[PDB]
């Protein structure tokens, strides 16, 4: 419908009906649910919520299916005085029933359209079982692996982070202006505004503190693309930024994500993080609560009830002006506008769309994109696909490989490794081991079914729930049973093959010491087994890249490529000397890099001419062969940094600026050209301005963040 | 002499020895010092240096003795210009020659006497040997045991960090409007400004980030307390504060420290940290890093010639004001001039007879035994009987290094192993030594034959010195892994043990205390250390001292400190066992101990007076309490006072130390402390920067750690006095 009719419906509305608008509830707080209906009534007298709450509260969050919500909005239009229906949302974070592999895993595909793909069928499938909206993409940068969510991220590097979130969106929404009629694609969140990944000691909700400057080098840039590609909504984070919950963060959220970012869709808080800004003690009680956070620009309590509860005697006493509550209606209405629910309030409703054969079968593409081969001695891999295979250890049969954050799809759809290897190996037997034991008599089951096959498939892992939401691990390991396992197999004299799965990044030094090749699959979702057939026995070759680095040990962390040089960084030439940065008991190194993953064919690049100079503000193209110089079709990441030899502040070794995942069939050879734009030379100075200061920069070209040609490029001259 | 005659001084000086002054270089670059000249001619050559240069440098570092000073003060003093004599520096740490112990156990005695004693015992022995500043004290906040340094910081929190600094400052220099009278007192400078202990994964040199209101709630204070106690000089940080290398950045020196905290004296780099700023990538060569340098207000470059070779072309080219230079110097002439240079040069210089006094080393002994921290002691176990039958076992039962790391001068044939320790008290001691990084058989056996003989296993396990100090990182806060497998062995002998640990850093000690039955941490105690040892362990010393820094679980526990923010879903009681709360799925919240802890053999009781419920905004609480020594044994207890904000516009700790006095009790002996929280206490940087006092709720808690407290609500409002 038009403008002024959504204009005039906020001049209709009661008080009591705008701010319950700018409630969220769980679907069996509502009548009309399919589901639940023995947690309503307890739940209802704990919130203190009334018909007229429910009745006019703005939103819904966790539908469990298309019946429900045609229930609950089936039932709420019924008595809804002037028929804003309800927008729905929920958490579709790698997929809704078809699987993709977890967002760390999809950033290690390197691959923009896998991750527009991933997006795009996840929307065309939670559309059709009913929610408007994703709580996705997820944006936090990560430098902490004890931290459970960074299964949620893309990773340590911005850039990456910002092109795969824009790619998100783009497969979430298609075209934003359109989505009141392409009703199988649906609006985007982005999450969690902001810095909420740098959680100290990785410990879950812990403070977040970092200078202004580094909030807007390294922290914000991934929100920032998601918004300006189109983002419908945002949401708050759980911890403090700079001493304040980010929830009632008035400079946060109105100065730079409103001002700055020019956002002007629904700010939602995070789950209750409107009532916990008085557990971060920064408000007195539920009053300050909604008040700070009204004045925050916060639109939507998502489960919690300070607002519905105290925004009436706030505004009546005149300590917040009605303003605010209408601007945030205003942007309710004109989300549920842009989604079309004034026309059609159940977008459509399409279950011919859920879990097809060609979904599944994307599914599985993203699994073998997102992979990554960290270790292959002597070409063990890829498998004949007559070796006598023994699988042995906790993922050889569990059926827990579709991931965290994994709200809708189901185990039982799920294909686990024995099932998926069985279908390409002719001789398969099997030894599955618990997740925290190793038995006297599992090992002699081992012994015995190793002995009689040609290699071992080693399936070792992490339970799910070991990591996601308040999954924090203190030391970064596999259980230490798996480890002995895997030293035990070891001595059967047979080749090794070590399928890791898991949600983070692990100490895995004592794995691929103690196997032939190791395979980091992390959680591939529904078609798992098939991606790690597949890539096992060649069919597919693996492609993938380390996006967030693998530590030396726990304590390296945090470690990540784009670091600062120090003032006495180790070099190859003063190594060994006592008074340089360095520790007495590991390397510097991460035990693998960014940018790393191996592959079953191999390449050659070459970097055209540049040159030597180039004024401010003129862009850098960056010309690249690449050939594939053996016999396998495969694929390379080429990948492009930058550094900043001298500047005003002190600036990483290098950054990522740009990089393409190249197809290449065996003999073949292709060229790609990048941009580096004077904005991949630019970086925010003391004093907060975004500026490219004339001077000497590095560009780095390979494979990796260490297999790299090195370029100089000489700026100054004038501006374009 | 007069300030008349020190600005004609520098009117005088050429451009050229007006660069040279803001030079500083070791001992054997210069005429006339007796050891290593043969480094001199190759070296002198690799930094480009000549006469002209070492004939006018302002300053020199690590002179050898008073022999080495002497020799090069008369060979200067013949051919300088104008007689401008040299100021010699040192790292005068925890001690000179009578070795004390190392500044984090020093934290932990949790005693600004203490304190100040080690620092005037210092002070006497360093100007007896001809040295006239110390770089100490180090005041960086720690909250990273992976970092080497923190057995330079007296800990975790801002306000100990910030008295004890105020104790040393006071301990070496005196009244330091007299530094040219009292010549057994010495200048201190101040040391790393600023936040070098945040530095990213405890890894050495690194990387420090946080925001600016961080800065000043907890990196800045100590710093400020010492330079407001007069502290006569500053030396930079080796790290970036804010994306800058601290040496040249401008608004932390120029607006910061001499602005905002008044700092008029000499500020001197770290070593090389000049040249450095180049390594950082903010300076493009020595040209460019002594530009910035100067502008940032650095006096005087620590053993680097990017000022030497570069700042006359600065000047001359108009690049950079010959005011500020003028201004350097000023500044170094006044530092010689206050410490008398110009009447005394030798600076009273034969005081041989004043190093390593018996009377000194019992100084050092008591600054041990109030420092040591008692952490386990099941069924009174400790302390011994004189006539137990003792298996001494370990590394540190006869290792010599028990000095600790930063002992630049101290000799280890003049300190106390464990065994001459303990074999001076305990008549029955049988030794078992073994190696720090191994445990073979051949060593079991020995242990074994060693503890069936005697009554009590004494474990003595430790860190080598060189395991931490300067670019002695860890990423694993861990002894060797021989050493946990030897507490391990030793359990199982069936005989009750003692654990004596000595280190420069928490370790995990939680499988060292699962293994024995009493765990003392000495840290390095210094020259008397198996004095020290011998003492508690008998009983002739009552361990007192408090951790000033949390023991983690383990190592990616870190940072963990008591001084923690609450976050939007603490963990309580009542939530316990709830999936969605702030924790760890493998480990506690709260590290295995926490700051403030310590045991004793004695048994303490306090009472707290009644507190008002109410205050005015600007006035003070004043906290009376009364302590009662309940047992026969008489002892010290640290008594402590911590606040905390409960609604603030930031996010506030859920606890902040705000007093602390340790109280001497005999048996039965009952005192009455009080503690003045002025309103300071009850304020915090806000948003804006602004130090602010709030109106709201407080509580005040008091007690024996931040974890054993009373607690009590103030509120906060009404009218500002
Ligand atoms: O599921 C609702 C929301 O729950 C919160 O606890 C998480 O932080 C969000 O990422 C999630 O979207
Ligand atoms: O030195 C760089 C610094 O610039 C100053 O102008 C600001 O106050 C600081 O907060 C920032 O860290
Ligand atoms: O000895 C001169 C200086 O050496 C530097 O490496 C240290 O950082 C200082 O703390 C010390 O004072
Ligand atoms: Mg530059
Ligand atoms: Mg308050």
Same mark, same amino acid.
């Given at each position: 419908?038009?403008?002024?009719?959504?204009?005039?419906?906020?001049?209709?509305?009661?008080?009591?009906?705008?701010?319950?608008?700018?409630?969220?509830?769980?679907?069996?707080?509502?009548?009309?649910?399919?589901?639940?209906?023995?947690?309503?009534?307890?739940?209802?007298?704990?919130?203190?919520?009334?018909?007229?709450?429910?009745?006019?509260?703005?939103?819904?969050?966790?539908?469990?299916?298309?019946?429900?919500?045609?229930?609950?909005?089936?039932?709420?239009?019924?008595?809804?005085?002037?028929?804003?229906?309800?927008?729905?949302?929920?958490?579709?974070?790698?997929?809704?029933?078809?699987?993709?592999?977890?967002?760390?895993?999809?950033?290690?595909?390197?691959?923009?359209?896998?991750?527009?793909?991933?997006?795009?069928?996840?929307?065309?499938?939670?559309?059709?079982?009913?929610?408007?909206?994703?709580?996705?993409?997820?944006?936090?940068?990560?430098?902490?692996?004890?931290?459970?969510?960074?299964?949620?991220?893309?990773?340590?590097?911005?850039?990456?982070?910002?092109?795969?979130?824009?790619?998100?969106?783009?497969?979430?929404?298609?075209?934003?202006?359109?989505?009141?009629?392409? %009703? /199988?694609? *649906?609006?985007? &969140?982005?999450? $969690?505004?902001?810095?909420?990944?740098?959680? =100290?000691?990785? #410990?879950?909700? @812990?403070?977040?503190?970092?200078?202004?400057?580094?909030?807007?080098?390294?922290?914000?840039?991934?929100?920032?693309?998601?918004?300006?590609?189109?983002?419908?909504?945002?949401?708050?984070?759980?911890?403090?930024?700079?001493?304040?919950?980010?929830?009632?963060?008035?400079?946060?959220?109105?100065?730079?994500?409103?001002?700055?970012?020019?956002?002007?869709?629904?700010?939602?808080?995070?789950?209750?993080?409107?009532?916990?800004?008085?557990?971060?003690?920064?408000?007195?009680?539920?009053?300050?609560?909604?008040?700070?956070?009204?004045?925050?620009?916060?639109? %939507? /309590?998502? *489960?919690?009830? &300070?607002?519905? $509860?105290?925004?009436?005697?706030?505004?009546? =006493?005149?300590? #917040?002006?009605? @303003?605010?509550?209408?601007?945030?209606?205003?942007?309710?209405?004109?989300?549920?506008?842009?989604?079309?629910?004034?026309?059609?309030?159940?977008?459509?409703?399409?279950?011919?769309?859920?879990?097809?054969?060609?979904?599944?079968?994307?599914?599985?593409?993203?699994?073998?994109?997102?992979?990554?081969?960290?270790?292959?001695?002597?070409?063990?891999?890829?498998?004949?696909?007559?070796?006598?295979?023994?699988?042995?250890?906790?993922?050889?049969?569990?059926?827990?490989?579709?991931?965290?954050?994994?709200?809708?799809?189901?185990?039982?759809?799920?294909?686990?490794? /024995?099932?998926?290897?069985?279908?390409?190996?002719?001789?398969?037997?099997?030894?599955?081991? =618990?997740?925290?034991?190793?038995?006297?008599?599992?090992?002699?089951?081992?012994?015995?079914?190793?002995?009689?096959?040609?290699?071992?498939?080693?399936?070792?892992?992490?339970?799910?729930?070991?990591?996601?939401?308040?999954?924090?691990?203190?030391?970064?390991?596999?259980?230490?049973?798996?480890?002995?396992?895997?030293?035990?197999?070891?001595?059967?004299?047979?080749?090794?093959?070590?399928?890791?799965?898991?949600?983070?990044?692990?100490?895995?030094?004592?794995?691929?010491?103690?196997?032939?090749?190791?395979?980091?699959?992390?959680?591939?979702?529904?078609?798992?087994?098939?991606?790690?057939?597949?890539?096992?026995?060649?069919?597919?070759?693996?492609?993938?890249?380390?996006?967030?680095?693998?530590?030396?040990?726990?304590?390296?962390?945090?470690?990540?490529?784009?670091?600062?040089?120090?003032?006495?960084?180790?070099?190859?030439?003063?190594?060994?000397?006592?008074?340089?940065?360095?520790?007495?008991?590991?390397?510097?190194?991460?035990?693998?890099?960014?940018?790393?993953?191996?592959?079953?064919?191999?390449?050659?690049?070459?970097?055209?001419?540049?040159?030597?100079?180039?004024?401010?503000?003129?862009?850098?193209?960056?010309?690249?062969?690449?050939?594939?110089?053996?016999?396998?079709?495969?694929?390379?990441?080429?990948?492009?940094?930058?550094?900043?030899?001298?500047?005003?502040?002190?600036?990483?070794?290098?950054?990522?600026?740009?990089?393409?995942?190249?197809?290449?069939?065996?003999?073949?050879?292709?060229?790609?050209?990048?941009?580096?734009?004077?904005?991949?030379?630019?970086?925010?100075?003391?004093?907060?301005?975004?500026?490219?200061?004339?001077?000497?920069?590095?560009?780095?070209?390979?494979?990796?963040?260490?297999?790299?040609?090195?370029?100089?490029?000489?700026?100054?001259?004038?501006?374009?």
């Amino acid at each position: 419908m038009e403008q002024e009719k959504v204009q005039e419906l906020v001049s209709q509305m009661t008080l009591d009906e705008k701010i319950a608008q700018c409630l969220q509830l769980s679907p069996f707080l509502f009548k009309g649910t399919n589901k639940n209906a023995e947690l309503t009534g307890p739940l209802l007298q704990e919130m203190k919520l009334t018909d007229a709450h429910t009745e006019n509260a703005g939103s819904v969050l966790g539908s469990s299916s298309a019946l429900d919500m045609i229930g609950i909005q089936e039932a709420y239009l019924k008595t809804n005085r002037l028929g804003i229906p309800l927008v729905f949302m929920a958490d579709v974070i790698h997929g809704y029933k078809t699987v993709f592999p977890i967002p760390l895993a999809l950033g290690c595909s390197f691959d923009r359209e896998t991750v527009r793909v991933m997006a795009e069928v996840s929307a065309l499938e939670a559309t059709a079982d009913g929610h408007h909206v994703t709580f996705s993409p997820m944006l936090d940068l990560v430098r902490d692996p004890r931290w459970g969510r960074v299964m949620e991220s893309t990773g340590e590097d911005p850039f990456l982070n910002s092109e795969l979130g824009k790619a998100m969106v783009d497969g979430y929404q298609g075209d934003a202006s359109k989505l009141n009629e392409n %009703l /199988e694609q *649906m609006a985007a &969140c982005v999450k $969690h505004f902001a810095a909420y990944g740098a959680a =100290e000691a990785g #410990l879950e909700y @812990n403070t977040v503190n970092m200078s202004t400057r580094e909030l807007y080098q390294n922290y914000l840039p991934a929100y920032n693309a998601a918004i300006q590609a189109g983002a419908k909504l945002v949401m708050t984070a759980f911890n403090v930024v700079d001493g304040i919950p980010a929830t009632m963060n008035k400079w946060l959220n109105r100065d730079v994500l409103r001002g700055e970012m020019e956002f002007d869709g629904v700010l939602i808080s995070d789950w209750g993080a409107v009532a916990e800004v008085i557990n971060h003690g920064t408000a007195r009680n539920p009053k300050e609560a909604a008040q700070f956070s009204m004045e925050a620009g916060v639109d %939507l /309590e998502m *489960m919690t009830t &300070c607002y519905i $509860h105290e925004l009436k005697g706030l505004i009546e =006493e005149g300590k #917040l002006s009605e @303003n605010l509550l209408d601007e945030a209606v205003l942007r309710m209405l004109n989300l549920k506008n842009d989604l079309g629910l004034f026309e059609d309030p159940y977008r459509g409703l399409r279950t011919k769309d859920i879990l097809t054969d060609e979904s599944r079968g994307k599914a599985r593409a993203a699994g073998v994109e997102s992979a990554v081969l960290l270790e292959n001695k002597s070409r063990l891999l890829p498998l004949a696909k007559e070796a006598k295979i023994a699988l042995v250890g906790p993922l050889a049969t569990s059926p827990d490989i579709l991931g965290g954050w994994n709200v809708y799809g189901e185990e039982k759809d799920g294909i686990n490794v /024995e099932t998926g290897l069985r279908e390409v190996f002719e001789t398969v037997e099997v030894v599955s081991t =618990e997740y925290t034991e190793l038995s006297e008599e599992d090992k002699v089951a081992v012994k015995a079914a190793v002995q009689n096959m040609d290699v071992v498939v080693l399936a070792l892992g992490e339970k799910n729930e070991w990591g996601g939401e308040a999954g924090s691990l203190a030391t970064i390991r596999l259980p230490e049973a798996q480890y002995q396992l895997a030293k035990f197999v070891q001595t059967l004299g047979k080749p090794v093959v070590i399928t890791l799965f898991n949600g983070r990044p692990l100490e895995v030094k004592e794995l691929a010491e103690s196997s032939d090749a190791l395979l980091e699959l992390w959680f591939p979702g529904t078609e798992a087994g098939r991606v790690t057939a597949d890539l096992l026995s060649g069919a597919s070759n693996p492609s993938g890249k380390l996006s967030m680095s693998f530590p030396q040990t726990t304590g390296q962390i945090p470690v990540y490529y784009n670091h600062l040089r120090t003032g006495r960084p180790q070099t190859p030439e003063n190594k060994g000397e006592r008074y340089v940065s360095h520790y007495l008991d590991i390397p510097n190194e991460p035990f693998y890099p960014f940018g790393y993953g191996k592959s079953y064919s191999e390449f050659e690049l070459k970097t055209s001419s540049l040159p030597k100079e180039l004024n401010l503000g003129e862009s850098l193209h960056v010309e690249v062969t690449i050939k594939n110089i053996s016999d396998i079709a495969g694929k390379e990441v080429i990948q492009v940094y930058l550094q900043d030899v001298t500047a005003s502040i002190s600036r990483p070794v290098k950054e990522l600026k740009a990089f393409e995942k190249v197809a290449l069939q065996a003999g073949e050879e292709k060229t790609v050209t990048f941009e580096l734009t004077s904005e991949a030379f630019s970086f925010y100075n003391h004093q907060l301005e975004k500026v490219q200061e004339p001077g000497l920069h590095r560009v780095f070209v390979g494979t990796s963040s260490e297999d790299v040609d090195v370029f100089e490029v000489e700026v100054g001259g004038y501006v374009l």
